[PDB]
């Protein structure tokens, strides 16, 4: 219902690895905009 697999796939497409994206969406409580900010901020 929340669109988790689609949200994982979308953020993976922005250049992030599966485990990072999964973990960021968890932290963000499935908010794509917030997970994206996490991924950008803490990229290495």
């Amino acid at each position: 219902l929340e669109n988790v697999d689609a949200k994982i796939a979308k953020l993976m497409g922005e250049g992030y690895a599966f485990e990072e994206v999964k973990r960021a969406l968890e932290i963000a409580q499935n908010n794509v905009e917030v997970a994206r900010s996490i991924l950008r901020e803490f990229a290495f």
């Binding site: 988790v4 697999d5 689609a6 994982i8 796939a9 993976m12 599966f18 999964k22």
Partner: protein, 72 residues
């Protein structure tokens, strides 16, 4: 049985599969119908990234399940 694979470009690919098909088999089918090599493919289902040597059934992927494809 049939499963679906959604791509980020909005495409829905329908595959003809058996429960015992390996993830690599599934990647090969996607290649046959779309042209993407298995090594450029990442498949996501039910919060998991699908591993090559395991089967659809190992992930409780049933008829009419939708996988999500991301290209590397």
């Amino acid at each position: 049985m049939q499963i679906f694979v959604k791509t980020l470009t909005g495409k829905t690919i329908t595959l003809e599969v058996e429960p015992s098909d390996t993830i690599e088999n599934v990647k090969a089918k996607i290649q046959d119908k779309e042209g993407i090599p298995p090594d450029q493919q990442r498949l996501i289902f039910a919060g998991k990234q699908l591993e090559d040597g395991r089967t659809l059934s190992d992930y409780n992927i049933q008829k009419e399940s939708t996988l999500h494809l991301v290209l590397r």
